[PDB]
């Protein structure tokens, strides 16, 4: 849901802030990597003929087989305010956003281009050991500092705020240290671009003027640089927050040249192997991975007992297991963390023993675990055995007159949420102490 | 005439004959029960009941392994 | 730490564990070993070349820990070091090899200690000189060590013949352990016995290499060999004493079992009953010839309280006569109080203890370094599981879910009676009872086994089906075993803790539990081993199923836990059974009936 919630973030913004977005060649370039290919297709069929279109002419194009895309790319081509779907004489006439598509229309053919792509300096020196290994020695200080292992070069004091404030790594400063929340753990088990989308909607989410479209323009042609070059130091907002992502790690500044690394290019886009875990009936880990971060996220949630050079060992424990669970992880959580550490092998085995089974039957009298349960299904039932319960504490009625109270005043509650537990035919049932805004109400009434 | 505020847990009738172990070894806590899926409970004392459940499986297990 | 090795920041979680200051050799690939420093644990792949070929010295001079699918687990042990240099196999050339096989460089702590696991090998020897304990040396250089300690009391003195086992212990924390390897050929004064085998018996492999074993020198070395069951341990023991050739006798604390050893004995072997011979609690009549056998009991030594003038003439009889070899079978059970008097009457000059598991609930098993000596040979259970010499086992668990007035009067229930009470949940009964539905409408061979005598009566009574416990009338049980074997009408049996062994029955295929000792490890696997010996073990298709019903919510969680993780160790992990399929299509359940289940507890309560 990334390009989605990024879409979202975009749709939340109004019509003219996203206007004023429309305007630069870059940011159209990648709002233009954002969209689906039917949408894409949509907009190159039209920026090069300026003729309003009738839908039925897009109806009579679309084939039914992708009817349901293209109403989702249409959908959010409206609701983004890039088009401009208006019905007249009778038939809705379609229109890509003009600035959108000057824009557009500008990369393609190379005209004014205003060094959207980059104010350049162009004094170029080498990335692979001066950017990357700057990049590779700030991102290590920032995720062992997110593992929680004591080390020198902490964070720094905006993101040191953001982890405070946000809900990601909640600085418990009544304990005096940095935690892991559950949404840490995803952000944990987020693919490197997600988190930096996680990162930039929360620092997005919290600053405020520090312009709005100074930050969404800045990051974009951000997004669009290439590597390894000097460029000029562009607005005030957007250089104090270039200086901001140099203290990231993200930029190798010289204090008006910057030379931004391969973290740029990531963010547009991404890019018995590594990471090849051997699950075992005995506990033991064979991972055909080896890294300190491998060792520093493993030991959260397993005994370990020694470090190869790619087959770092040790045991899952039940202690270690609810060791994850006090921790606030998820035993989805782990359980998704183990298909993305999964071992050709079990899998070739399991893939076999897969068709096999569904040569015979569906349902084979058992639950359903592709993977190799016994490694699994033992910590599963123990996962089963982790939760197991549920708590209502506050107001609780009881002994109805009649079910006049359920399917109009708890069907209804049921989708504005202000009720803990539905039962009916017990005659009670609970809600919450802050949800007793509009239940008790109609109930006297 | 009887609607009162009390702690209501979903629970089991083994965790149930547990809560009235708590009231066994110290009586007078736990108010009343409803059935095996429904007690009520002193709601000063549901982390102090927490806190006991959580050795109560600690008696159950123990887990030492060492 | 023969590095710099700056820390990773969670390394210290790696207490004295991160052993990658030593470095990798670039031979990492084709070589399998890691090597603990400390621990030495001792890490060996599978899928890696000579693994196979060194997966032999692993075993000789290392223990093994573990052996999964992919990346077995060993542990080098003074044990395994002492059993390795007894066999001959010198230190340098053991580093050479173990280094030239090891992916890294090998550590000194490990180096060092097996060059302080050298011995004073071939230094002490105590002969039987006719019953009388001579304990030579083969120079008089070891006398001027050995009179350095006290406690006794080419150049042989007097000791105690009992002491013996005790001053094995002393010599082995002063380090210089004596060696037993018969020259039964140089041994002419005891009369041979020179008994020979058919040739349609076939020895297997793993066999052979156990018989390789003692025969590393052709001297009969003594020790342990501990074998899974029903691989024809009683065959290897018949080829042992038929290349042994001398006079020899066979000790289990048992009387079927015993008897129907002498039956397999004399049918195999080419040996006729005129040399052989038996004594129990029945019959005490002996052979007289000059060479031959007699298969007998511990029962016949352990008990010297109060037995009769016959029983008096027999043992005065054998412990007369000087026998060359003998053979213990399950010797799990000797080291206790009247037991282990057996090894301290009988002097032969060959030893061997022999059992299906050399677990216990304790550590008496150690004594076995001053009793009966190193471990010879063992066979791996996967191994001849999926070569078919053993069976392929389906293991399963069945949580039954303890009703609720049960368990709060388990809650008032005092201690050691609270066993029986989860135990007799109805829940338990209604589950056993659709599965014997569903596994004789699958027509499977049901066995439950149970430590309380009554209640596998009270089970077996509830299906009207017969019982067998410890303490009922002989022929009442042959009956009930007539029936369930030769007629095919009859086909399920409650057994316990007298019929968990000392009978053979591979014909067990189904195998269920409800009720054992609280760290009964070893006597949970001599329940297993029943069906261990199912023979329908090569054909595809096969799954044999073991189930275990336990009442949910109790401490025998933790009791069958701990009982059941010896067979995880041998590699036989249980399924997950608490929700079933089924449960209500049977349509009658027992004690489905809450007032029934009240009148149960009632009955329980009125025993109680
Ligand atoms: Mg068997």
């Given at each position: 849901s990334l390009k989605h919630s990024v879409t979202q973030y975009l749709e939340e913004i109004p019509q003219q802030v996203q206007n004023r977005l429309y305007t630069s060649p870059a940011t159209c370039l990648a709002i233009y990597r954002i969209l689906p290919p039917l949408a894409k297709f949509f907009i190159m069929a039209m920026v090069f003929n300026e003729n309003e279109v009738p839908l039925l002419d897009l109806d009579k194009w679309?084939?039914?087989?992708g009817k349901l895309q293209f109403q989702n790319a249409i959908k959010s081509m409206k609701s983004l305010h890039l088009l401009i779907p208006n019905k007249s004489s009778?038939?809705?006439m379609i229109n890509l956003n003009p600035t959108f598509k000057i824009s557009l229309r500008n990369a393609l053919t190379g005209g004014e281009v205003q060094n959207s792509f980059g104010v350049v300096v162009e004094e170029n020196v080498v990335s692979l050991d001066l950017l990357d290994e700057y990049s590779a020695n700030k991102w290590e200080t920032i995720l062992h500092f997110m593992v929680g292992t004591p080390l020198a070069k902490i964070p720094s004091e905006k993101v040191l705020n953001l982890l405070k404030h946000?809900?990601?790594?909640?600085?418990v400063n009544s304990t005096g240290e940095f935690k892991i929340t559950n949404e840490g753990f995803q952000f944990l088990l987020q693919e490197i671009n997600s988190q930096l989308w996680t990162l930039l909607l929360q620092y997005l989410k919290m600053i405020?003027?520090?312009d709005l479209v100074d930050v969404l323009h800045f990051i974009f042609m951000l997004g669009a640089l290439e590597v390894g070059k000097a460029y000029k130091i562009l607005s005030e907002t957007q250089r104090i927050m270039l200086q901001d992502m140099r203290d990231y790690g993200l930029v190798f500044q010289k204090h008006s040249i910057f030379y931004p690394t391969k973290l740029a290019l990531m963010l547009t886009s991404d890019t018995i192997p590594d990471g090849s875990l051997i699950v075992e009936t005995n506990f033991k880990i064979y991972s055909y991975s080896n890294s300190p971060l491998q060792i520093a996220v493993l030991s959260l949630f397993v005994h370990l007992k020694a470090r190869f050079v790619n087959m770092v060992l040790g045991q899952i424990t039940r202690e270690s297991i609810r060791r994850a669970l006090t921790n606030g992880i998820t035993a989805d959580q782990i359980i998704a963390y183990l298909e993305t550490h999964a071992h050709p092998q079990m899998r070739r085995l399991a893939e076999e023993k897969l068709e096999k089974k569904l040569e015979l039957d569906p349902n084979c009298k058992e639950p359903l675990?592709?993977?190799?349960?016994?490694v699994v299904d033992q910590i599963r039932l123990w996962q089963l055995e982790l939760d197991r319960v549920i708590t209502y504490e506050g107001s609780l009625y009881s002994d109805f007159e009649?079910?006049?109270?359920?399917?109009?005043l708890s069907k209804y509650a049921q989708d504005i949420g202000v009720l803990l537990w539905k039962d009916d035919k017990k005659k009670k049932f609970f809600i919450s102490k802050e949800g007793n805004s509009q239940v008790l109400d109609f109930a006297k009434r | 005439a009887r609607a009162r505020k009390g702690a209501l847990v979903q629970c089991d009738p083994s965790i149930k004959a547990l809560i009235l172990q708590i009231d066994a070894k110290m009586s007078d806590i736990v108010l009343e029960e409803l059935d095996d899926t429904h007690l009520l409970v002193n709601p000063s004392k549901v982390e102090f009941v927490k806190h006991e459940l959580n050795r109560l499986l600690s008696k159950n297990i123990y887990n030492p392994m060492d | 730490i023969p590095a710099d090795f700056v820390p990773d920041?969670?390394?210290?979680?790696?207490?004295?564990?991160?052993?990658?200051?030593l470095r990798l050799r670039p031979d990492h690939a084709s070589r399998p070993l890691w090597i603990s420093p400390?621990?030495?644990?001792i890490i060996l792949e599978?899928?890696?070349?000579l693994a196979e070929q060194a997966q032999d010295f692993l075993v000789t001079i290392a223990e093994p820990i573990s052996r999964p699918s992919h990346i077995h687990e060993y542990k080098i042990t003074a044990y395994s070091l002492y059993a390795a240099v007894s066999v001959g196999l010198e230190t340098d050339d053991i580093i050479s090899v173990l280094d030239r096989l090891s992916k890294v460089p090998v550590a000194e702590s490990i180096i060092n200690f097996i060059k302080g696991a050298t011995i004073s090998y071939g230094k002490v020897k105590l002969v039987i000189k006719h019953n009388r304990?001579?304990?030579?040396?083969?120079?008089?250089?070891i006398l001027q060590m050995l009179l350095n300690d006290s406690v006794i009391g080419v150049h042989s003195f007097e000791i105690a013949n009992e002491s013996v086992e005790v001053v094995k212990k002393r010599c082995q924390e002063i380090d210089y352990p004596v060696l037993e390897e018969y020259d039964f050929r140089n041994d002419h004064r005891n009369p041979d016995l020179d008994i020979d085998l058919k040739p349609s018996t076939q020895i297997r492999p793993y066999q052979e290499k156990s018989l390789s074993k003692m025969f590393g020198?052709?001297?009969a070395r003594s020790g342990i060999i501990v074998l899974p069951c029903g691989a024809g341990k009683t065959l290897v023991g018949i080829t042992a004493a038929c290349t042994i050739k001398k006079s020899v006798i066979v000790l289990c604390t048992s009387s079927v079992s015993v008897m129907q050893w002498r039956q397999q004995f004399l049918q195999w072997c080419?040996?006729?009953?005129?040399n052989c011979a038996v004594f129990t609690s029945d019959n005490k009549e002996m052979f007289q010839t000059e060479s031959g056998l007699?298969?007998?009991?511990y029962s016949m030594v352990a008990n010297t309280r109060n037995r009769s003038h016959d029983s008096q003439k027999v043992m005065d009889f054998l412990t007369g006569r000087e026998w060359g070899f003998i053979i213990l079978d399950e010797?799990?059970?000797?080291?206790?109080a009247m037991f282990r008097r057996v090894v301290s009457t009988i002097a032969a000059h060959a030893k061997l203890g022999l059992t299906?598991?050399?677990?216990?609930?304790?550590?008496?098993?150690?004594d076995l370094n001053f009793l009966i000596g190193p471990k010879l040979y063992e066979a791996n259970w996967m191994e001849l599981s999926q070569k078919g010499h053993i069976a392929n086992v389906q293991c399963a668990e069945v949580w039954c879910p303890m009703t609720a007035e049960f368990y709060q009067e388990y809650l008032r229930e005092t201690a050691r009676k609270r066993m029986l009470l989860y135990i007799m949940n109805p829940t338990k009964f209604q589950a056993c009872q659709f599965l014997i539905q569903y596994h004789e409408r699958r027509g499977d061979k049901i066995i439950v086994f149970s430590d309380n005598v009554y209640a596998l009566q009270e089970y077996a009574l509830k299906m009207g089906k017969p019982f067998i416990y410890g303490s009922t009338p002989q022929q009442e049980r042959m009956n009930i075993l007539q029936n369930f074997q030769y007629n095919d009408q009859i086909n399920t049996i409650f057994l316990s803790k007298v019929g968990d062994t000392s009978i053979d029955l591979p014909e067990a295929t189904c195998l269920i539990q409800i009720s054992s000792h609280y760290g009964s490890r070893r006597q949970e696997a001599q329940r297993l081993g029943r069906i261990l010996?199912?023979?329908?073990?090569?054909?595809?298709?096969f799954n044999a199923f073991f189930y275990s019903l336990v009442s949910k919510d109790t401490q025998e969680m933790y009791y069958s836990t701990k009982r059941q993780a010896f067979l995880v160790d041998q590699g036989y992990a249980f399924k997950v059974i608490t929700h079933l399929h089924g449960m209500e299509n049977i349509p009658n359940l027992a004690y489905a009936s809450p007032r029934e289940r009240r009148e149960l507890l009632q009955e329980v309560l009125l025993k109680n």
């Amino acid at each position: 849901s990334l390009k989605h919630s990024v879409t979202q973030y975009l749709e939340e913004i109004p019509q003219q802030v996203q206007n004023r977005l429309y305007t630069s060649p870059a940011t159209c370039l990648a709002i233009y990597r954002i969209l689906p290919p039917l949408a894409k297709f949509f907009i190159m069929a039209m920026v090069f003929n300026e003729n309003e279109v009738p839908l039925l002419d897009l109806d009579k194009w679309v084939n039914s087989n992708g009817k349901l895309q293209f109403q989702n790319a249409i959908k959010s081509m409206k609701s983004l305010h890039l088009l401009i779907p208006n019905k007249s004489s009778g038939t809705l006439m379609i229109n890509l956003n003009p600035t959108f598509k000057i824009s557009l229309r500008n990369a393609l053919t190379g005209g004014e281009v205003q060094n959207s792509f980059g104010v350049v300096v162009e004094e170029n020196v080498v990335s692979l050991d001066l950017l990357d290994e700057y990049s590779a020695n700030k991102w290590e200080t920032i995720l062992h500092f997110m593992v929680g292992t004591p080390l020198a070069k902490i964070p720094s004091e905006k993101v040191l705020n953001l982890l405070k404030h946000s809900k990601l790594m909640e600085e418990v400063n009544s304990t005096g240290e940095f935690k892991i929340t559950n949404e840490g753990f995803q952000f944990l088990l987020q693919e490197i671009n997600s988190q930096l989308w996680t990162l930039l909607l929360q620092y997005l989410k919290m600053i405020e003027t520090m312009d709005l479209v100074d930050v969404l323009h800045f990051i974009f042609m951000l997004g669009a640089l290439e590597v390894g070059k000097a460029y000029k130091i562009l607005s005030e907002t957007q250089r104090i927050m270039l200086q901001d992502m140099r203290d990231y790690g993200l930029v190798f500044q010289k204090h008006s040249i910057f030379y931004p690394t391969k973290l740029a290019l990531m963010l547009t886009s991404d890019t018995i192997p590594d990471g090849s875990l051997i699950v075992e009936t005995n506990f033991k880990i064979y991972s055909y991975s080896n890294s300190p971060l491998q060792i520093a996220v493993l030991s959260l949630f397993v005994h370990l007992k020694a470090r190869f050079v790619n087959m770092v060992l040790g045991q899952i424990t039940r202690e270690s297991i609810r060791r994850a669970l006090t921790n606030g992880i998820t035993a989805d959580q782990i359980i998704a963390y183990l298909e993305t550490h999964a071992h050709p092998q079990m899998r070739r085995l399991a893939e076999e023993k897969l068709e096999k089974k569904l040569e015979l039957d569906p349902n084979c009298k058992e639950p359903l675990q592709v993977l190799p349960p016994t490694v699994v299904d033992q910590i599963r039932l123990w996962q089963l055995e982790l939760d197991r319960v549920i708590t209502y504490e506050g107001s609780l009625y009881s002994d109805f007159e009649t079910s006049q109270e359920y399917n109009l005043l708890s069907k209804y509650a049921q989708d504005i949420g202000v009720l803990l537990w539905k039962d009916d035919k017990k005659k009670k049932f609970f809600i919450s102490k802050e949800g007793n805004s509009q239940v008790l109400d109609f109930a006297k009434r | 005439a009887r609607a009162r505020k009390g702690a209501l847990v979903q629970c089991d009738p083994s965790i149930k004959a547990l809560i009235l172990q708590i009231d066994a070894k110290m009586s007078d806590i736990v108010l009343e029960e409803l059935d095996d899926t429904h007690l009520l409970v002193n709601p000063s004392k549901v982390e102090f009941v927490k806190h006991e459940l959580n050795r109560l499986l600690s008696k159950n297990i123990y887990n030492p392994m060492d | 730490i023969p590095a710099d090795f700056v820390p990773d920041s969670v390394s210290g979680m790696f207490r004295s564990h991160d052993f990658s200051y030593l470095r990798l050799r670039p031979d990492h690939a084709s070589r399998p070993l890691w090597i603990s420093p400390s621990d030495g644990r001792i890490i060996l792949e599978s899928f890696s070349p000579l693994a196979e070929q060194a997966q032999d010295f692993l075993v000789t001079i290392a223990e093994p820990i573990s052996r999964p699918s992919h990346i077995h687990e060993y542990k080098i042990t003074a044990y395994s070091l002492y059993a390795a240099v007894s066999v001959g196999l010198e230190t340098d050339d053991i580093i050479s090899v173990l280094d030239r096989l090891s992916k890294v460089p090998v550590a000194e702590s490990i180096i060092n200690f097996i060059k302080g696991a050298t011995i004073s090998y071939g230094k002490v020897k105590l002969v039987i000189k006719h019953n009388r304990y001579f304990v030579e040396t083969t120079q008089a250089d070891i006398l001027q060590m050995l009179l350095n300690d006290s406690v006794i009391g080419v150049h042989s003195f007097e000791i105690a013949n009992e002491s013996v086992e005790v001053v094995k212990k002393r010599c082995q924390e002063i380090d210089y352990p004596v060696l037993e390897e018969y020259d039964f050929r140089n041994d002419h004064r005891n009369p041979d016995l020179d008994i020979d085998l058919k040739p349609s018996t076939q020895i297997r492999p793993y066999q052979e290499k156990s018989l390789s074993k003692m025969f590393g020198n052709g001297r009969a070395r003594s020790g342990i060999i501990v074998l899974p069951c029903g691989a024809g341990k009683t065959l290897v023991g018949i080829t042992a004493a038929c290349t042994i050739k001398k006079s020899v006798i066979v000790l289990c604390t048992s009387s079927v079992s015993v008897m129907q050893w002498r039956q397999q004995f004399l049918q195999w072997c080419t040996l006729q009953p005129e040399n052989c011979a038996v004594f129990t609690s029945d019959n005490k009549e002996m052979f007289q010839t000059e060479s031959g056998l007699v298969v007998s009991t511990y029962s016949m030594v352990a008990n010297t309280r109060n037995r009769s003038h016959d029983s008096q003439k027999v043992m005065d009889f054998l412990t007369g006569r000087e026998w060359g070899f003998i053979i213990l079978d399950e010797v799990h059970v000797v080291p206790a109080a009247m037991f282990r008097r057996v090894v301290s009457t009988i002097a032969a000059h060959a030893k061997l203890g022999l059992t299906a598991t050399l677990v216990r609930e304790d550590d008496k098993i150690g004594d076995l370094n001053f009793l009966i000596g190193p471990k010879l040979y063992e066979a791996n259970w996967m191994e001849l599981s999926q070569k078919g010499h053993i069976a392929n086992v389906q293991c399963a668990e069945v949580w039954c879910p303890m009703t609720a007035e049960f368990y709060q009067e388990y809650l008032r229930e005092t201690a050691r009676k609270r066993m029986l009470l989860y135990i007799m949940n109805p829940t338990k009964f209604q589950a056993c009872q659709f599965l014997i539905q569903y596994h004789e409408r699958r027509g499977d061979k049901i066995i439950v086994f149970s430590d309380n005598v009554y209640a596998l009566q009270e089970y077996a009574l509830k299906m009207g089906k017969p019982f067998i416990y410890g303490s009922t009338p002989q022929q009442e049980r042959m009956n009930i075993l007539q029936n369930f074997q030769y007629n095919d009408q009859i086909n399920t049996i409650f057994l316990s803790k007298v019929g968990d062994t000392s009978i053979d029955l591979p014909e067990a295929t189904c195998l269920i539990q409800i009720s054992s000792h609280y760290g009964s490890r070893r006597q949970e696997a001599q329940r297993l081993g029943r069906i261990l010996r199912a023979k329908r073990r090569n054909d595809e298709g096969f799954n044999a199923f073991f189930y275990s019903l336990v009442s949910k919510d109790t401490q025998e969680m933790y009791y069958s836990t701990k009982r059941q993780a010896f067979l995880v160790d041998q590699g036989y992990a249980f399924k997950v059974i608490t929700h079933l399929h089924g449960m209500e299509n049977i349509p009658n359940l027992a004690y489905a009936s809450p007032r029934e289940r009240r009148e149960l507890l009632q009955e329980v309560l009125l025993k109680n």
